């Protein structure tokens with residue numbers, strides 16, 4: 401099912417970027433936000449799919465996983481989903497998903513069939529996987545806040561079986577799921593370029609982006625990394641240079657590897673997540689019924 | 698089949714009380730105040746009272762579910778991951794019948810909780826996107842076929858219609874086939890008068906936005922005429938009571954008209970109302986609108 405015909409993007413109705421740092425000013429130039437789709441209900445988890453040169457993201461509430469093609473076309477990749485939220489792409493260019501409904505991590509084939517990868521920790525059902533990433537070694541890392549258990553429009557209500565909201569690492573060899581850290585409503589996550597630092601946001605309690613040291617098979621030196629001026633640092637991404645681009649109530653905030661705020665990119669509505677394409681020349685941002693994109697020069 | 702709302706008392710709705718000018722309607726309502734039975738959907742539609750299960754069945758069109766309100770306040774998912782089910786109705790055998798934007802057809806559910814196809818084409822071409830339906834005393838299913846489900850991603854799958862008309866159809870209980878009874882402009886809600894001599898059908902285009910009345914005599918609809926216009930918004934879905942009054946949804950709540958088309962009063966609702974229906978005894982009025990399912994308990 402094609403939900404948007406091929407066609408050019410239309411400028412988004414919002415104020416141009418507010419840039420402080422000269423380095424970010426050079427990166428964005430006079431780029432202006434564009435609207436790629438605006439017919440969803442609750443856009444989430446954008447992930448660039450190089451193998452298909454498609455931007456994958458889901459409409460959590462509409463229970464679909466959509467795919468934006470470079471010609472502007474938007475197709476339905478997965479329909480009538482079990483409330484899929486976050487999306488990611490593995491080393492084999494396969495799509496992996498966080499599903500609120502099945503409360504698990506799944507992986508789709510070519511037929512568009514999402515197969516279960518894990519739905520329990522130590523024999524107890526996960527809360528409701530929210531966002532995920534795939535490390536270079538193939539392990540899938542993800543957050544498990546209880547959001548999918550407290551809102552009917554986003555899953556099936558239920559009292560949690562687990563007494564913790566954790567960040568987990570699913571080994572690529574089939575070994576047991578690993579509880580890496582307990583947080584307060586962990587949400588988005590992303591590794592630093594060298595994977596020595598893992599960033600995870602918490603959106604209950606302190607609303608922030610937390611940093612962890614990834615070394616010797618565990619997470620260490622937990623500390624506050626950054627806070628966004630408005631709203632929640634929901635989903636976010638880190639570019640090859642080390643900058644963290646995070647969603648927020650008013651748009652996307654950009655921070656350097658030291659946590660310094662460099663600038664803000666307004667969006668017409670609350671932003672839920674964001675990611676870059678392969679070349680990192682296009683910044684995709686999800687939020688409400690929309691998929692926005694900022695073309696960098 | 699999960700439970701989306703635990704059992705528990707309803708909460709009064711945050712809206713103004715009924716504005717009643719008619720004395721007869723003031724008596725019918727008494728001091729009744731609107732209640733909220735559910736507020737966690739996205740686009741509530743097609744409420745239908747299911748006597749056999751003493752449950753109010755309705756759809757969350759955008760959320761792709763058909764929900765069921767139990768009298769203790771519990772709300773369960775009756776049909777999940779639907780093909781954008783909109784209108785719901787109950788046939789003589791107490792089976793649920795549905796209008797599905799996605800499958801562009803009329804379907805019927807079994808005790809298995811599975812909706813099976815009844816009809817999805819006219820003259821070999823796919824229907825536009827069945828919106829609302831009713832079941833006549835003779836078992837025939839009547840429904841409206843506007844193209845809403847073909848021009849909004851959040852409510853179906855976009856496509857160019859195969860039919861060059863938006864019709865009201867009649868599906869015979871014996872041997873079909875579908876009967877094209879009338880063509881309208883975005884036909885939406887529909888309901889029969891108690892004696893079934895008049896069929897009311899609303900038209901809600903982007904040419905008139907109104908509730909239209911037809912004469913149902915012989916084997917066709919005759920004498921098309923304007924019946925009423927609601928003060929605000931669209932007369933989406935509506936129902937008719939045993940006395941002949943037509944209770945219709947609108948942008949500000951439910952409007953009540955007598956059989957002569959005279960406005961009797963207005964029942965404010967906190968948000969736009971999409972449809973409404975009564976329970977078996979017609980002692981409780983259920984109203985759908987956005988994330989909500991509201992109810993007005995009559996004395």
Ligand SMILES: [Ca+2]
Pocket residue numbers: 481482483500501502555556
């Ligand atoms: Ca589910």
Ligand SMILES: [Ca+2]
Pocket residue numbers: 530531587588634635672673
């Ligand atoms: Ca998230």
Ligand SMILES: [Ca+2]
Pocket residue numbers: 446532533636637674675
């Ligand atoms: Ca990501």
Ligand SMILES: [Ca+2]
Pocket residue numbers: 401476479799853854
């Ligand atoms: Ca579809």
Ligand SMILES: [Ca+2]
Pocket residue numbers: 742828829885886933934971972
């Ligand atoms: Ca309708």
Ligand SMILES: [Ca+2]
Pocket residue numbers: 744786830831935936973974
């Ligand atoms: Ca009805």
